[PDB]
């Protein structure tokens, strides 16, 4: 995407989202990141939405194929699950590479740095879902989430939607990846309760944003308890 203007890549990413063309969206946003400038808040969201949709479809397909493979236990189901798995790992490696070159190191503000570290934890978590260096991948996810948590607790109010989404995803990591359901439940509860106590400070629009993510925390707590 080296010959396209940064602003044109961003515009095309927005069009790709409207057209539900998420692979295109991700390629446009990768091109925008590779221009070397920092990303605005809206541009970070475009980057995250694009890759979340791409890897979300891969993960859903991997789960279908892994279930068929486990039920069967010819080489075709394993071969095809392996093909999807390799593609998924390639997308995660691409996102992690963008974060490492050089989005995180240039992110000084808490909002941007927490956003990228949450992404780093998420994409290591997706790698962990298919891994069997499994321990090192899990530790990489945990380390990224933990640094994001530490910054968010110092620099952001408890209702900040990025802080809330980070805590939600880290709790999912604890429950689904790290075999730590009690840590997952504790984190979700503490996060919910501290956000509840801070809602009084918010405008109607911010209240809507924060309460929507609190409902996701409550939905997980209901499923886990």
């Amino acid at each position: 995407m080296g010959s396209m203007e940064r602003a044109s890549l961003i515009q095309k990413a927005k069009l790709a989202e409207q057209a539900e063309r998420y692979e295109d969206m991700a390629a446009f946003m990768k091109g925008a990141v590779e221009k070397g400038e920092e990303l605005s808040c809206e541009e970070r969201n475009l980057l995250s939405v694009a890759y979340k949709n791409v890897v979300g479809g891969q993960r859903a397909a991997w789960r279908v194929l892994s279930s068929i493979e486990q039920k069967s236990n010819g080489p075709e189901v394993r071969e095809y699950r392996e093909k999807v798995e390799t593609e998924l790992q390639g997308v995660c490696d691409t996102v992690l590479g963008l974060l490492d070159s050089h989005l995180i190191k240039e992110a000084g503000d808490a909002e941007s740095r927490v956003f990228y570290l949450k992404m780093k934890g998420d994409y290591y978590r997706y790698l962990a879902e298919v891994a069997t260096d499994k321990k090192r991948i899990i530790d990489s996810a945990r380390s990224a989430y933990q640094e994001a948590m530490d910054i968010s607790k110092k620099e952001m109010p408890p209702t900040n939607p990025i802080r809330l989404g980070l805590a939600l995803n880290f709790s999912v990591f604890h429950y689904e990846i790290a075999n730590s359901p009690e840590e997952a439940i504790s984190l979700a509860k503490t996060t919910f309760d501290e956000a509840m106590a801070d809602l009084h400070t918010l405008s109607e629009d911010s209240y809507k944003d924060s309460t929507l993510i609190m409902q996701l925390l409550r939905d997980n707590l209901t499923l886990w308890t």
Partner: peptide, 7 residues
């Protein structure tokens, strides 16, 4: 369970 959906 559920992570942040992402739009």
């Amino acid at each position: 369970a559920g992570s942040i959906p992402g739009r």
